[PDB]
Design a protein around this ligand. Structure first.
Ligand SMILES: CNc1ncnc2c1ncn2C
Length: 150
């Protein structure tokens, strides 16, 4: 199905993933999520990725998926974990910020079995009404220098 904008939660297990992603405009995900994001990319004007570190209580920003997984793109940049991921794809971060799940109140996701937004696993899609607002709220905050003090 075609659509204009779709929105996916991305979880990061180590902060260095986010720092590498910001420095080089790149991401990779599990093989199943890679297929899901690739299918969205070719049928949707904009695929937005909303980044949330495992260890954090919220989002560190959001970006646009710019290209499909490409085995030639930054091969092995994540280290040996590359062996259990799909191929790398380009991402343009549109905002670096700090927004806590708790700042949003107790939001649940009807496209994820009524789970709290804060319990979203990697690759969880959110409905556009919620995804658009999350991105709007992130954009309206001061940018956070995520790489400061790292
Ligand atoms: C750079 N992305 C990743 N790194 C390590 N593990 C991951 C990733 N995505 C999903 N999982 C399980």
């Amino acid at each position: 199905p075609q659509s204009t904008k779709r929105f996916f939660i991305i979880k990061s297990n180590r902060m260095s993933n986010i720092y590498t992603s910001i420095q080089h405009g790149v991401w990779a995900t599990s093989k199943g999520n890679s297929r899901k994001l690739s299918n969205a990319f070719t049928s949707t004007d904009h695929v937005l990725l909303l980044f949330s570190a495992n260890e954090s209580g919220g989002f560190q920003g959001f970006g646009r998926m710019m290209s499909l997984p490409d085995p030639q793109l930054f091969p092995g940049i994540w280290g040996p974990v590359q062996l259990r991921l799909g191929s790398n794809f380009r991402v343009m971060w549109l905002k670096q910020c700090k927004i806590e799940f708790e700042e949003l109140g107790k939001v649940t996701n009807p496209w994820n079995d009524d789970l709290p937004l804060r319990k979203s696993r990697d690759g969880t899609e959110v409905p556009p009404a919620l995804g658009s607002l999350l991105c709007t709220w992130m954009s309206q905050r001061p940018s956070e220098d995520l790489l400061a003090g790292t």
